[PDB]
């Protein structure tokens, strides 16, 4: 299907904001530890007006509007998500960045064997997806930075973009096309 750039943009921004966690806070003039004493009398002196050491205008005060642990989780519509994935795979095919084979596994947990197989396939920064998940296949590409191995259910459009080519199990293609419908 033709490419909907603004839709895909909205979806990937939502996914990154979902990756973001809300761990920050500061202290207000309620939470700065101190006293409610007026530092000096309202009148009599030639100094400024004074009410509390805790105000942000004073040194060692609060922040004027302190931060709270806020959830950045956006809401993604299911049809918008699925249309973004349909468009993103169609654009992968149009960029010729997608290869489909029947079988892709190796029967030993060795990154040496995996790297030799990727050299034999002429592959550098790729994305592996499976029908069902193999022990040794996942173990052989955990330690490889440019390669992620996943189940066909656990997909994200951001890693569908980020890796230079995507290779797919044919059973995974069947599961994806069933899962999109």
């Amino acid at each position: 299907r033709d490419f909907n750039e603004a839709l895909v943009h909205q979806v990937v921004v939502a996914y990154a904001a979902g990756a973001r966690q809300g761990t920050r806070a500061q202290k207000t003039r309620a939470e700065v530890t101190g006293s409610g004493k007026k530092p000096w009398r309202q009148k009599g002196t030639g100094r400024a007006r004074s009410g509390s050491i805790k105000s942000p205008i004073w040194r060692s005060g609060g922040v004027t509007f302190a931060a709270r642990p806020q959830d950045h989780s956006q809401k993604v519509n299911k049809k918008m998500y699925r249309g973004a994935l349909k468009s993103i795979l169609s654009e992968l095919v149009r960029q010729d960045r997608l290869i489909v084979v029947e079988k892709f596994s190796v029967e030993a947990p060795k990154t040496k064997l995996l790297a030799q197989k990727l050299k034999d396939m002429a592959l550098e920064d790729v994305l592996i997806i499976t029908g069902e998940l193999d022990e040794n296949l996942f173990l052989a590409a955990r330690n490889l930075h440019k390669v992620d191995v996943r189940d066909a259910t656990g997909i994200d459009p951001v890693s569908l973009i980020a890796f230079d080519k995507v290779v797919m199990t044919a059973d995974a293609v069947k599961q994806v096309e069933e899962m999109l419908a």
Partner: protein, 143 residues
């Protein structure tokens, strides 16, 4: 391709940053103007405050009541009446086709949209043209 994305133009709007310079237009006072209760920290009237003058929600009479019966009646169009899982229309199966709801005890079959299929209708109140439409497809009034 990840660094090649711009959204739809005019979707992300810039936003107002007040009190941060003359050339913005929102320099001194930032859209709030000079002195006044409106020119204060949380200086705000309530809803419908017309000064001391007695407002429109307060100088008029209050009237009416709530039936506690209309809230548990509802209304049924003609298009829906086809999603009743088979072709019978009851207090049930509309409740189970999720058009009316659980607490509903009474119902009416108002003419709205084309009706297509023969439908047996059981135990409702039925309007004039919609009765004739249900009979035009082949249905029948039945208590």
């Amino acid at each position: 391709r990840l660094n090649t994305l711009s959204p739809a133009e005019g979707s992300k709007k810039a936003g107002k940053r007040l009190g941060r310079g003359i050339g913005s237009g929102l320099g001194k006072t930032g859209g709030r103007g000079h002195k006044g209760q409106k020119s204060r920290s949380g200086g705000g009237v309530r809803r419908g405050f017309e000064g001391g003058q007695m407002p429109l929600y307060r100088r008029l009479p209050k009237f009416g009541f709530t039936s506690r019966k209309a809230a548990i009646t509802a209304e049924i169009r003609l298009s829906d009446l086809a999603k009743v899982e088979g072709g019978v229309v009851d207090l049930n199966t509309l409740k189970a086709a999720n058009i009316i709801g659980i607490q509903i005890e009474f119902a009416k079959v108002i003419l709205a949209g084309e009706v297509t299929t023969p439908v047996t209708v059981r135990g409702l109140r039925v309007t004039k043209g919609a009765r004739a439409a249900i009979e035009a497809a082949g249905g029948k009034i039945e208590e």
